Amino acid sequence: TQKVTPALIFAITVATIGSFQFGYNTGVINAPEKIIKEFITKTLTDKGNAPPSEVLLTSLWSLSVAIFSVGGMIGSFSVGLFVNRFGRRNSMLIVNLLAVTGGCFMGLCKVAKSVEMLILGRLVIGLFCGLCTGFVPMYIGEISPTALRGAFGTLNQLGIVVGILVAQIFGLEFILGSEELWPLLLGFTILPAILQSAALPFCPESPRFLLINRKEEENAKQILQRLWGTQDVSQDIQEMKDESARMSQEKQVTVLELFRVSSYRQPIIISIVLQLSQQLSGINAVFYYSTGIFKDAGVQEPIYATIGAGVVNTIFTVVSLFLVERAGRRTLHMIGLGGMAFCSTLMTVSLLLKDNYNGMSFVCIGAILVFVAFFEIGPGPIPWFIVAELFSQGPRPAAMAVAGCSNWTSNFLVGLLFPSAAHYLGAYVFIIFTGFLITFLAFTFFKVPETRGRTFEDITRAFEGQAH
């Protein structure tokens, strides 16, 4: 009987520090916007230049923010370069050099009076975070017992939302979000990197990686027994040997081959679509602009409403954690897509009617908080770990590179295109997100298999069975 040992908890918690990194760096940038723009202005005039226009300031601000996404796009797509070469554990250890570097560029850019270092810092930390968003579910997916793969997979998203919450709190200007201390707000990302790097050598390599990739059955078997607290891992070892046998009969998997081979096309389209369902839900937009929408809905101090949204963000991630093995992935993902379709619709109605009818403002405030709760029930955590369950050992790294890249890329696209669309459509802009949510609800119901409690082998065989 398999058990959740302290060893297993340790290995997984240490992995999700990378999750916390993604969450922190993603969210930290919003609060000090004015402070950093003032920094950008003061830097330019401290050299031999006129004060920047609003246009140049915006453009330099936008760049500081967006280059992080560009880094994440490149990093997440590059994961395949690391995990087969160095293994899963060592890849995580290695890439913390990017985290310390990017963090020091950001922490020093003010005293160095360099807008360039700020941008470079964001790009490097973006690269690190992209590699992480791929590394962590792959490691967690490969060391969790099958019966708890989904629950442990949800610890990845939990670290992310705790990352975001902490960045919001630190961003308070009586904490680190001031004119003098914002370099530390940004450079804080250094500290978790150092902590994780210290603990990582004591975490095990993936036994799946050791047995299947590196053909070290007796080492793998010994990891498994300690990690799960049982001598009897015969079935798990045998499933891995089956996977080893199939990987030996197939060519090395490339990214392109995923779309060529029938058996891989179905799971990769599912994988990519589910990332879109995460990002084309409007979560970027909703979180970023929630403060402005709270304020126009009358919230006297809208920062605290936003931190309140971050807390809701965390609570319902934990709710999902406890339901995903009982409800299954399909159910949790559809409920969350459905609920969000309802809330985004309600945001449009509220905003349209707010100036004519009384409490529609409060309904607007509610719609946003309930949106975030439905987002974390399913579309938040599930897309990040489910790709790991849709493939066996051979295709997984290339598959996760592709799916993770599509997550970052579509997130980038939401950030890029939403202000234009909001400009033209106003309150109706949330009906665009509603449309995607409904489309992806239908896709999920019809196309996404239940993965709960199934071995990779079983899941892969069913895909091969359809392709015939």
Ligand X SMILES: OC[C@H]1O[C@H](O[C@H]2[C@H](O)[C@@H](O)[C@@H](O)O[C@@H]2CO)[C@H](O)[C@@H](O)[C@@H]1O
Residue 222 counted as an annotated binding residue: no
Q: Please, which contacts does 99-105 make with residues 24 or more away whose CB atoms are closer than 8 Å?
A: 99/21, 99/125, 99/128, 99/189, 99/190, 99/192, 99/193, 100/190, 100/193, 100/194, 102/126, 102/127, 102/128, 102/189, 103/186, 103/187, 103/188, 103/189, 103/190, 103/193, 104/187, 104/190
Q: Is 290 in the site for ligand X (CB under 6 A)?
A: no
Closer to ligand X by CB, 371 or 456: give it.
371
> Minimum CB separation from ligand X for residue 298, in Å?
22
Amino acid in the structure at residue 234: S
Closer to ligand X by CB, 287 or 433: give it.
287
Residue 252 counted as an annotated binding residue: no
- For residue 304, give the 3-state DSSP assignment: helix
Closer to ligand X by CB, 107 or 137: give it.
137
Closer to ligand X by CB, 121 or 207: give it.
121
Say how many residues touch ligand X, by CB under 6 A: 15
> Minimum CB separation from ligand X for residue 392, in Å?
25
| Residue 136 near residue 219 (C-beta atoms within 8 A) | no
User: How many of the other CB atoms lie within 10 Å of CB of 70?
Assistant: 18
Closer to ligand X by CB, 68 or 463: give it.
68
Name the one range near ligand X by CB under 6 A: 99-107, 153-161, 235-243, 337-345: 153-161
> Minimum CB separation from ligand X for residue 167, in Å?
8
| Residue 126 near residue 70 (C-beta atoms within 8 A) | yes
| Residue 216 near residue 210 (C-beta atoms within 8 A) | yes
Phi/psi class of residue 203: alpha, beta or left (left: φ > 0; alpha: ψ in -120 to 50)?
A: beta
Amino acid in the structure at residue 104: C
> Which x/- pattern, by CB under 6 A, does the window 88-107 give for ligand X?
--------------------
Nearest-5° Cα angle at 218, 216 to 222: 115
Interacting residue with ligand X among 161, 337, 399, 429 (CB under 6 A):
161
Q: Is 157 in the site for ligand X (CB under 6 A)?
A: yes
Residue 384 counted as an annotated binding residue: yes
User: Rounded to the nearest 10 degrees, what angle do helices 456-466 and 234-249 cross at?
Assistant: 40
Report the alpha-carbon distance of residue 79 to residue 91 in Å, rounded. Answer: 9
Name the one range near ligand X by CB under 6 A: 111-119, 156-164, 333-341, 355-363: 156-164
Please name which of 138, 68, 220 lies closest in space to residue 402, comparing C-alpha atoms.
Answer: 138
> Which x/- pattern, by CB under 6 A, does the window 260-279 give for ligand X?
------------------x-
Residue 313 counted as an annotated binding residue: yes
User: How many of the other CB atoms lie within 10 Å of CB of 358?
Assistant: 9
Binding residues among 26-45 for ligand X as defined by CB under 6 A: 26-27, 30
Amino acid in the structure at residue 410: S
Name the one range near ligand X by CB under 6 A: 25-33, 117-125, 218-226, 434-442: 25-33
Report the alpha-carbon distance of residue 403 to residue 279 in Å, rounded. Answer: 12
Binding residues among 164-183 for ligand X as defined by CB under 6 A: 164
Report the alpha-carbon distance of residue 15 to residue 200 in Å, rounded. Answer: 8
> Minimum CB separation from ligand X for residue 121, in Å?
17
Closer to ligand X by CB, 284 or 392: give it.
284
> Minimum CB separation from ligand X for residue 69, in Å?
8
Interacting residue with ligand X among 24, 39, 188, 288 (CB under 6 A):
288
Report the alpha-carbon distance of residue 378 to residue 373 in Å, rounded. Answer: 9
Q: How many residues are there in the chain?
A: 468
Residues with Cβ within 8 Å of 9's Cβ and at least 6 positions away in sequence, in order, are: none
Q: Is 154 in the site for ligand X (CB under 6 A)?
A: no
Q: Is 196 in the site for ligand X (CB under 6 A)?
A: no
Report the alpha-carbon distance of residue 399 to residue 76 in Å, rounded. Answer: 11
Using alpha carbons, list the distances in angstroms from residue 227 to 3, 28, 143, 193, 209: 8, 35, 8, 24, 15
Residue the block writes with tokens 């060592």: 90
Residue 238 counted as an annotated binding residue: no
Closer to ligand X by CB, 140 or 223: give it.
140
Binding residues among 312-331 for ligand X as defined by CB under 6 A: 313
Interacting residue with ligand X among 32, 267, 338, 380 (CB under 6 A):
380
Residue 213 counted as an annotated binding residue: no
Residue 279 counted as an annotated binding residue: yes
Residue the block writes with tokens 């630190």: 170
Name the one range near ligand X by CB under 6 A: 92-100, 122-130, 256-264, 284-292: 284-292
Interacting residue with ligand X among 283, 309, 327, 332 (CB under 6 A):
283
Name the one range near ligand X by CB under 6 A: 35-43, 108-116, 136-144, 282-290: 282-290
Interacting residue with ligand X among 101, 350, 411, 444 (CB under 6 A):
411
Please give the annotated binding residues, written as ranges: 157, 278-279, 284, 313, 376, 384
Residues belonging to the binding site for D-glucose are 157, 278-279, 284, 313, 376, 384
Binding site for ligand X (CB under 6 A): 26-27, 30, 157, 160-161, 164, 278, 283-284, 287-288, 313, 380, 411
